[PDB]
Enzyme design. Structure first.
Site, PDB file in Angstrom:
ATOM      1  N   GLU A 786      20.783  11.921 -28.448  1.00 34.32           N
ATOM      2  CA  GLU A 786      21.260  13.025 -27.634  1.00 34.32           C
ATOM      3  C   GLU A 786      22.414  13.663 -28.396  1.00 34.32           C
ATOM      4  O   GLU A 786      23.399  12.991 -28.726  1.00 34.32           O
ATOM      5  CB  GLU A 786      21.698  12.546 -26.249  1.00 34.32           C
ATOM      6  N   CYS A 820      29.183  17.714 -24.111  1.00 35.13           N
ATOM      7  CA  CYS A 820      28.011  18.193 -24.824  1.00 35.13           C
ATOM      8  C   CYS A 820      27.421  19.424 -24.142  1.00 35.13           C
ATOM      9  O   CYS A 820      26.872  20.300 -24.811  1.00 35.13           O
ATOM     10  CB  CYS A 820      26.959  17.075 -24.917  1.00 35.13           C
ATOM     11  SG  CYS A 820      27.575  15.577 -25.750  1.00 35.13           S
TER      12      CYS A 820
END
Ligand SMILES: Cc1cc2nc3c(=O)[nH]c(=O)nc-3n(C[C@H](O)[C@H](O)[C@H](O)COP(=O)(O)OP(=O)(O)OC[C@H]3O[C@@H](n4cnc5c(N)ncnc54)[C@H](O)[C@@H]3O)c2cc1C
Ligand SMILES: NC(=S)Nc1ccc(F)cc1
Lengths: 1199, 112, 56, 56
Positions: A786, A820
Site C-alpha cells: 500500500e 496516504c
C-alpha cells in the site's frame, strides 16, 4: 521544557456542582432521562382536559384557513415545479426589472433558457423541499433541464411570469421578513400593531475566516442600531430584539479552542451586548450543536457577571429541549440569574440539529446520543422544562418557542390565570407561526404575547441554510396531513410516554454508536473531547503515560535480544524523550524468520475461531488501554489527540473486523502461507501496524513485525497487547530497526509473504527482491503493498464553499498532511476559484501548529528533520518558479521540533506537480467547466489512484466524474480522509497499491494458499465478451476450455455492488470492477485460453506476450473479443498493466516474475501456474485478484 | 409495445416517444432524461476541441447531456409485477454526411 | 379496454407535452390490421389526431 | 417479533375499526383498479365474467 500534558485542556473555570450535573447528563441513557421528565410534566386531570379542548379549538381554527396553486394551474409535474422555481430564482438575480422582463419575453419564453442563464439547478434541493416536501442531497439536473424545456415549450411566457412572481414573494417576503434590517423593520409594523413582537436573525453562522467573523460582527452591530432606533424605548418585552449565533463571531468556536473563545469571541459578544443595553433591546444567544452547549455557558456566566452590563435584563439564551442536559442547564441558568440579579430571557426550543447530532455521535463512537431519539421524548422534555421555567418567572423570563398547538395549550393551561406582559411569552417563526398565534395574541383570543423570529437577508444567504429551516414527525407537516385527525394531534405526549412498556426506550430504528455494525462486530468506542469529565480524566491518564519508561526491544521467540539502544524523541520537541529502542541485528532478523518457520505448523494448528478470539481479546485490551495508548501516540508520532483516538479506534476495528471475517470464512482447507513479514509506516504506527499483523496472524501465519524506525514504542506496546491476548511469542516477533532489518527479513528464504505500507520506491525495491524467489509450491511470494497517492478533489460551482473549505483544510493538513489519503491537489472550477481560495487562505491562518500535548493544537510536527527538509525544498522550488505560496507563520516554540507550516501553492497546470510531497502542502489548480473531462484525464494520468474527492450537487457531474476517475476510494461531498474499516475498505490501484483493500473482505484471502469465498462475494452479471469467447472456443473445438470459460464467467464477482452499513447521513458503497489490461504470459495454447477466460470473465482486456509464439491460436476471434486482445513484444512499452497471468515451470515463472518486476509503473499482482496445474485445478488462477475494488462514500446529509 | 429489427420502426405504441413522431418538432417526453454521458461521445468532444472545432465540440457536449441513453424507470402497474422501461443504444447508425461539420454533428448525435 | 387505454394515455401524454411549437405533420394515413380491429385501429388514429393531424 | 407487545396483539379489531374516522376505508397503499395510474389517467374497466348479474 514544559512538562508533557501539563496544560492539555484546563477548563475555563472550576466546575460548580450545577455545571457538573449538566456534564453528567450529557449522554445519559434515554430510559434514565425520561421518568423524571414524565413526572415533572404531569398535570392534573382537569388541566389535561382543558388543555385538550384548547388545542382542539386551535387546530380546528388552523385547518379552517401558493406553489400548490401554481402547480395545479399549469398542470406541472413535481420536477417541472422545481425547475420553474430554479428558473425564477435565476431570473430574479437579474438586477433590473425591465431587463428581466425583456429576457423573459424575447429569449427565455422562446426556449433559449440555457443561453442567458453555474447550473440553473444549484439550489434545486431547496426548491424540491418547497415543492414536494422531500429532501435530497443532490439534484438530478438532467431531469430538471428536461422538465424546464418541457414546461416552457408547453406553457410559454405565462408560466415563467407566474413562477417569477411566486419566487419573489417567497424569497423576499415568506422566507425572510426582509432583505435588509431596514426593510424587515418596516414590515414588522403591521403585526406589532396587532400585539406581536419581533426578534431579528441576521442569518450569520459558522464563520470560516477572520474576515467572515468580522463581517457578521459588523452586520450584528448595524442591526442592533437599526433595531434599537426602531424600538424607540419600548423596552425588552414590548420592543424588538436581536438573535445572534456565537459561531458567526469567531472562526474557531469550539471547546478545543476555549482560550481563544474567551479571549477573542467573548469581548465581541460583550461589545454587542453593551450596544443592546444602551438601546434596551433583547439580545438572544442562539443554541447550536451539542458540543458547544457547555462552552456557551461559560460565556453566558461571564457576561451576566460583568458589571459593565448591569441594569439591563435583555440578555437571552436558548436551551434545546431535545437535549438530555436541558433541565440541568435550566437549573444552572436560573441560579445564574439569582446570583447576578439579571432576569435572563430563556428561549425554550425543541432543537434544530437532530439529524446532525445522530450522525456525529455514530461517527465518534460515543456512549450515547446527546439528544433524544424519539420525537415524543422531546415533547415530554419540553413540557417538563416549561414547568421548571414557569416556577421561576420571578428570576427568568421564559419564552416558549413552538408551533405545536398541543405543546402551546399544555403550557398555556400550566401557567394559570395570573398573567402580565413580562411574565412569559410565546415565540414562533416568521411565515410559519402566525396562523397559529393569530389565534393566541390579543384580548379576543388567549391574550398571550408572541414574539416572531424574523430572518433577515438576501437570496444568497436565505437559500444557504433554508433546508434546515417539514418532516413526517413535524407538527407543521402533520397539521397539513388529511390522514391525521385532531385527536392524534391533541394526544398528550406525557400520558402516551407514561403508558409505554419501557419508558424512555431508544428509537427502534436508530443504532447506538457501539451497535453500528449489529451482530457482525462491536464498533470501537471513542472519547468525547467536549466533555469536561472526560478531559479531566484524560489529562491525568496522558500525564501518567509520559512518566512511563516506554521501550522497544527485538522480541524473538526465544526472548528479548541485545542490540544497539537509542532514544526515541518527540518530533514536536526533541527535548522530550519518549523512550528507548533497542534495534535488531541483521543476524537476529534472519534468526527470527527461522524461528517463525519452525513455529508455523503450531500456529497454523490453532483453530481459526481461537485465533480470532485472540484478536477480539486484543481489541478489548486496546479499548481499555486507549487513554494510555493516546499519550504514547501523541508524543512518539506527533499526532493530535483526536487523530490518536481515531488511530486506536482503527486498530480495534481491524482486530474485530479480521476476527469476524475469519469466523465467516476460514477452514482447514485454507492453509497459511508461512512466515509473513509485516513492514509498517510511521504515520499510522499503531493502526496499520496492527491491521497487517492481525490479518496475517489470524490467517494462520506467524509474523515478523518490523515497525518504522521512527515509531518503535507504540509497536512494541501493540505486540505486548497481542501476546497478552494469547498470540504466542513464536507467532509474533518484533524486530525494531532501520531498512537493514527490513531488507534482511524480506530476503530470508523462509519468508512466505510480505505486507508493506510505505513509499512506492521502497515497495519497488521489495518487489525486486521477492521476484528472485518462489514459494515451496512454486508460486510467487505474495506482496501486499500500500503506497502513496497524488490525491485530488474536484469542486464545481454548485458546491457550498464553506463545506468545501472545511473538507479541504481537514483533508490536506490533518496530521500535517502525513496521511496516504491526504489531499494533494485541489481543482476549483474557474467561476468560484477566487472566492474559495480566499476563504481557504483565511481558514489556513486559523490553524494552531505546535507540540501536540495540547488540545488546542490542530496540526503537529512532521516526523523527522529529513521529512521537514524534503518538504521545504519542494516549497522553495515552487516559490522559486514564481508560484503563489501561502503559509502560516509558526510560533518560536516550534524551533525545538520539526514543523512545516501548512502551505497552499497555486499551480498553473497539474503537470507542475512532479513528485509526491508527503507533508502539509496543498496544491491548487483552476479549470473551465467544459474541460472537466480532460481534467479527470489529467488526474488519472499521474498513474496514482488512492483517494479522490468530488464536491457537487449535480447528479450528472457525479455520474460523469465517478465513472471516469480511476481511484480506489471515492468521497462525494465530504473530506477524503479517515477511511473506516469495513465501511470504506481502503486501498488504491496503479502506483497506489497492489490491493486487496485493507479492512475489506478480500484481504484475508491473500494470506492463505487457497482463498476462501468472502462474505457476500458473488455477482449475477456475466461479462459478455467472456461469453463471446466461450462460444468461439466451442466453435474451434476447444470444448473443455469453453466450459472452463463459462465457469469463470459464473464464478467472477465482477459487477458486485453492495451498500455497507455505517452511520446515518452517509451511503457507503463497495463495488468490483475490471482491473484494466492484464499481461498474459502463456506457454501453451490451452494455458492461453484459460488465462484469457480468467481475464475476460473479470471484465479486463489483455496484452499477450508475443514471444510465446501462440498467435495462430487466436484466429478469427469475434470482434468483441479482438477489441480486448493485443499482442506485446515490448511489455514496458505497452503498459501500464493491472496484473499478470503466467504459465510455466518454476524456472520460467521466476524469469517472468523478474521481468515483470522491471516494468515501470505499478507493482503488478502476478499469478502463476504450471501447465499441469491449469489442467488439474479450476482455481489455478484466482479471480479475486483480477477485479478492482472501489469504495465510494457519499455524504447524504450535505443538503 | 413494439420491437426492433424486422418487428418495426418504433417508437413503441402506448409509450412516451410515440406522439413525438407525429409532429415536426418532437417534445421532451415526461421523465425522459438520463444522468449518464456516453464516454466515447466525451472522447469525441475532446478530440474536436483539440482540432479547434469549437462549435462542434460544444454541439457534441450538448448532445451528450440531452441524450436519454441509460434511462431506467419503473412504470406504475399492478401489485405482484415489476414493469421496467429502459433506453439503450440502437446499434449501428448509417451516416450520410455532405460536409465535414455535418459529419461531426451526425457523429456526435450517434455517439451520444 | 386497450382502445380506451390508448385514448386516455395519448390524451394525458398530450396534456404533458404538446405546445404551439410542436407542429403537426399534416394528413396521416392510418392502416390497421384485422387481429386488433378496434384497439390498434384506435391507438394509431388517436395518436395522429391528438398530435394535431387529420386522419385517413 | 420482539417489537410487537402483547397489548398490540390483544387489541380488539371491532373497536379499533369503530373508532376510525371513516369506517371501512380502503387501505391507503392499495390502488382500486380504476386508480392504478393515479392522477395521470383513469384505468379502463373490464367486466366480471364470473358475476351472474353481469353474465345475464
Ligand atoms: C422562534 C424560534 C427560535 C428558535 N431558535 C432555535 C435555536 O437558537 N437553536 C435551535 O437548535 N432551535 C431553535 N428553534 C427550534 C427549531 O428550529 C424548530 O423550529 C423546532 O424544533 C420545531 O419544534 P416545534 O414545537 O415547532 O414542532 P414539532 O413538530 O413539535 O417538533 C419538532 C421537533 O422535535 C424534534 N424531533 C423530531 N424528531 C425527533 C426525534 N426522532 N427524536 C428527538 N427529537 C425529535 C426536533 O427538535 C424537531 O425540531 C427555534 C424555534 C423558534 C420558533
Ligand atoms: N525502511 C525499510 S524497512 N526498507 C526496506 C525493506 C526491504 C528492502 F528490500 C529494502 C528496504
Amino acid at each position: 521544557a514544559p512538562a508533557p500534558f501539563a496544560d492539555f485542556a484546563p477548563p475555563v473555570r472550576p466546575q460548580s456542582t450545577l455545571r457538573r450535573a449538566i456534564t453528567a447528563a450529557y449522554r445519559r441513557p434515554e430510559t434514565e432521562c425520561l421518568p423524571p421528565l414524565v413526572e415533572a410534566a404531569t398535570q392534573s386531570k382537569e388541566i389535561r382536559d382543558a388543555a385538550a379542548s384548547t388545542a382542539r379549538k386551535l387546530i380546528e381554527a388552523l385547518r379552517g384557513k401558493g406553489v400548490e396553486g401554481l402547480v395545479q394551474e399549469y398542470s406541472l409535474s413535481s420536477q417541472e415545479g422545481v425547475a420553474l422555481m430554479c428558473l425564477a430564482e435565476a431570473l430574479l438575480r437579474i438586477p433590473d426589472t425591465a431587463t428581466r422582463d425583456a429576457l423573459i419575453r424575447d429569449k427565455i419564453a422562446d426556449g433559449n433558457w440555457k443561453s442567458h442563464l453555474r447550473s440553473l439547478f444549484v439550489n434545486a434541493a431547496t426548491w424540491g423541499l418547497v415543492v414536494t416536501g422531500k429532501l435530497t442531497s443532490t439534484v438530478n439536473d438532467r431531469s430538471l433541464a428536461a422538465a424546464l424545456t418541457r414546461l416552457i415549450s408547453r406553457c410559454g411566457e405565462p408560466v415563467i411570469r407566474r413562477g417569477v412572481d411566486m419566487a419573489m414573494r417567497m424569497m423576499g417576503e415568506q422566507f425572510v421578513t426582509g432583505e435588509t434590517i431596514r426593510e424587515a423593520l418596516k414590515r414588522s409594523k403591521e403585526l406589532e400593531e396587532k400585539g406581536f413582537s419581533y426578534s431579528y436573525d441576521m442569518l450569520g453562522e459558522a464563520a470560516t475566516t477572520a474576515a467572515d467573523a468580522e463581517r457578521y460582527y459588523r452586520d450584528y452591530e448595524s442591526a442592533i442600531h437599526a433595531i434599537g432606533k426602531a424600538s424607540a424605548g419600548r423596552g425588552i418585552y414590548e420592543g424588538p430584539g436581536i438573535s445572534i449565533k456565537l459561531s458567526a463571531l469567531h472562526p474557531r468556536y469550539s471547546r478545543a479552542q476555549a482560550a481563544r473563545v474567551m479571549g477573542e469571541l467573548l469581548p465581541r459578544v460583550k461589545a454587542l451586548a453593551l450596544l443592546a443595553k444602551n438601546y434596551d433591546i433583547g439580545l438572544n444567544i442562539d443554541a447550536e450543536e451539542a458540543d458547544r452547549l457547555e462552552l456557551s455557558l461559560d460565556l453566558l456566566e461571564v457576561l451576566c457577571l460583568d458589571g459593565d452590563l448591569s441594569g439591563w435584563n435583555g440578555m437571552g439564551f436558548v436551551v434545546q429541549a431535545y437535549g438530555k442536559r436541558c433541565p440541568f442547564v435550566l437549573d444552572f441558568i436560573i441560579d445564574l440569574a439569582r446570583r447576578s440579579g439579571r432576569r435572563i430571557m430563556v428561549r425554550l426550543v425543541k432543537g434544530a440539529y437532530w439529524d446532525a447530532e445522530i450522525k456525529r455521535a455514530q461517527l465518534d463512537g460515543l456512549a450515547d446520543f446527546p439528544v433524544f431519539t424519539r420525537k415524543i421524548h422531546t415533547d415530554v422534555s419540553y413540557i417538563a422544562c416549561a414547568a421548571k421555567l414557569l416556577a421561576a418567572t420571578d428570576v427568568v423570563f421564559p419564552q416558549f418557542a413552538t408551533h405545536n398547538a398541543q405543546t402551546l395549550a399544555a403550557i398555556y393551561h400550566m401557567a394559570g390565570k395570573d398573567f402580565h406582559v413580562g411574565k412569559y411569552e410565546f415565540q414562533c417563526l416568521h411565515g410559519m407561526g402566525e396562523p397559529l398565534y393569530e389565534e393566541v395574541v390579543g384580548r379576543g383570543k388567549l391574550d398571550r404575547p408572541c414574539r416572531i423570529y424574523a430572518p433577515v437577508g438576501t437570496h444568497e444567504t436565505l437559500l444557504a441554510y433554508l433546508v434546515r429551516r417539514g418532516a413526517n414527525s413535524s407538527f407543521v407537516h402533520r397539521i397539513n396531513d388529511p390522514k391525521v385527525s385532531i385527536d392524534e394531534l391533541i394526544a398528550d405526549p406525557v400520558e402516551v410516554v407514561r403508558a409505554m412498556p419501557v419508558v424512555g426506550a431508544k428509537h427502534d430504528r436508530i443504532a447506538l454508536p457501539a451497535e453500528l455494525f449489529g451482530d457482525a462486530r462491536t464498533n470501537s468506542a471513542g472519547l468525547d473531547l467536549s466533555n469536561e469529565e472526560t478531559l479531566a480524566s484524560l489529562t491525568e491518564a496522558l500525564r501518567e503515560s509520559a512518566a512511563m519508561k516506554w521501550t522497544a526491544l527485538p522480541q524473538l521467540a526465544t526472548g528479548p535480544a541485545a542490540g544497539e539502544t537509542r532514544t526515541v524523541l518527540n518530533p514536536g520537541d526533541h527535548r522530550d524523550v519518549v523512550g528507548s529502542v533497542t534495534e535488531t541485528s541483521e543476524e537476529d532478523a534472519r534468526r527470527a524468520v527461522r524461528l517463525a518457520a519452525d513455529a508455523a505448523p503450531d500456529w497454523a494448528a490453532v483453530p481459526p475461531s481461537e485465533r480470532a478470539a485472540c484478536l477480539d481479546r486484543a481489541a478489548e485490551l486496546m479499548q481499555a488501554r486507549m487513554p494510555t495508548l493516546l499519550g504514547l501516540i501523541i508524543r512518539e508520532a506527533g499526532k493530535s489527540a483526536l487523530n490518536a483516538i481515531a488511530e486506536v479506534r482503527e486498530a480495534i476495528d481491524f482486530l474485530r473486523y479480521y476476527a469476524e471475517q475469519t469466523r465467516r470464512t476460514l477452514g482447514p482447507g485454507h492453509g497459511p502461507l508461512g512466515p509473513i513479514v509485516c513492514i509498517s509506516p510511521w504515520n499510522f504506527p499503531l493502526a496499520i501496524f496492527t491491521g497487517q499483523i492481525a490479518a496475517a496472524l489470524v490467517a494462520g501465519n506467524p509474523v515478523l513485525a518490523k515497525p518504522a524506525e521512527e515509531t518503535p514504542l507504540i509497536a512494541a506496546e501493540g505486540v505486548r497487547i497481542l501476546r497478552e491476548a494469547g498470540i504466542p511469542a513464536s507467532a509474533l516477533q518484533l524486530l525494531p530497526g532501520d531498512g537493514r532489518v527490513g531488507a534482511a527479513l524480506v530476503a530470508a528464504a523462509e519468508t512466505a509473504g510480505v505486507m508493506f505500507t510505505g513509499s512506492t520506491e521502497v515497495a519497488r525495491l521489495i518487489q525486486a527482491q521477492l521476484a528472485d524467489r518462489l514459494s515451496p509450491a512454486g508460486r510467487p511470494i505474495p506482496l501486499i503493498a500500500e503506497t502513496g497517492g497524488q490525491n485530488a478533489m474536484i469542486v464545481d460551482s454548485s458546491a457550498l464553499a464553506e463545506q468545501v473549505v472545511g473538507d479541504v483544510i481537514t483533508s490536506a493538513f490533518d496530521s500535517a498532511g502525513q496521511r496516504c489519503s491526504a489531499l494533494r491537489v485541489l481543482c476549483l472550477q474557474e467561476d468560484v476559484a477566487d472566492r474559495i481560495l480566499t476563504m481557504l487562505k483565511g481558514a489556513l491562518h486559523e490553524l494552531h501548529i505546535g507540540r501536540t500535548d495540547r488540545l488546542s493544537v490542530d496540526v503537529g510536527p512532521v516526523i523527522t528533520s529529513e521529512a521537514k527538509d524534503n518538504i521545504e525544498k519542494h516549497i522553495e522550488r515552487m516559490r522559486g518558479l514564481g508560484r503563489k505560496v501561502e503559509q502560516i507563520g509558526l510560533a518560536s516554540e516550534t524551533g525545538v521540533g520539526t514543523f512545516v507550516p501548512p502551505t497552499i501553492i497555486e499551480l498553473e497546470k497539474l503537470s507542475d506537480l512532479q513528485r509526491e510531497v508527503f507533508g502539509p502542502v496543498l496544491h491548487v489548480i483552476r479549470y473551465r467547466r467544459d474541460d472537466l473531462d480532460r481534467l479527470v484525464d489529467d488526474v488519472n494520468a499521474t498513474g496514482y489512484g488512492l483517494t479522490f474527492g468530488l464536491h457537487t450537487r449535480l447528479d450528472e457531474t457525479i455520474a460523469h466524474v465517478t465513472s471516469r476517475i480511476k481511484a480506489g476510494n471515492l468521497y462525494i461531498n465530504r473530506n477524503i480522509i479517515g477511511a473506516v474499516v469495513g465501511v470504506q475498505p481502503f486501498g488504491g490501484r496503479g502506483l497506489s497499491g497492489t490491493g486487496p483493500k485493507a479492512g475489506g473482505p478480500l484481504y484475508l484471502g491473500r494470506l492463505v494458499t487457497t482463498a476462501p469465498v468472502p462474505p457476500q462475494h458473488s455477482s449475477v452479471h456475466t461479462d459478455p465478451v467472456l461469453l463471446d469467447f466461450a462460444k468461439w472456443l466451442d466453435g474451434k473445438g476447444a470444448r473443455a476450455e469453453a466450459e472452463a470459460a463459462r465457469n469463470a464467467g459464473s464464478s467472477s464477482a465482477l459487477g458486485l455492488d453492495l451498500e455497507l452499513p455505517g452511520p446515518v447521513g452517509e451511503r457507503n458503497l463497495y463495488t468490483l470492477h475490471a482491473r484494466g489490461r492484464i499481461l498474459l504470459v502463456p506457454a501453451t495454447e490451452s494455458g492461453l485460453y484459460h488465462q484469457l477466460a480468467a481475464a475476460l470473465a473479470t471484465g479486463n482486456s489483455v496484452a499477450i506476450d508475443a514471444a510465446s509464439g501462440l498467435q495462430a491460436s487466436l484466429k478469427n476471434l469475434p470482434q468483441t473479443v479482438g477489441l480486448r486482445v493485443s499482442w506485446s513484444k515490448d511489455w514496458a512499452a505497452d503498459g501500464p498493466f493491472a496484473g499478470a497471468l503466467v504459465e510455466g515451470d518454476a524456472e520460467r515463472i521466476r524469469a517472468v516474475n523478474k521481468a515483470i518486476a522491471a516494468l515501470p509503473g505499478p507493482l503488478l499482482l502476478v499469478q502463476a501456474a504450471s501447465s499441469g496445474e491449469i489442467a488439474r485445478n479450476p482455481d489455478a488462477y484466482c479471480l479475486n485478484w483480477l477485479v478492482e475494488e472501489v469504495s465510494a462514500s457519499i455524504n447524504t446529509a450535505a443538503a
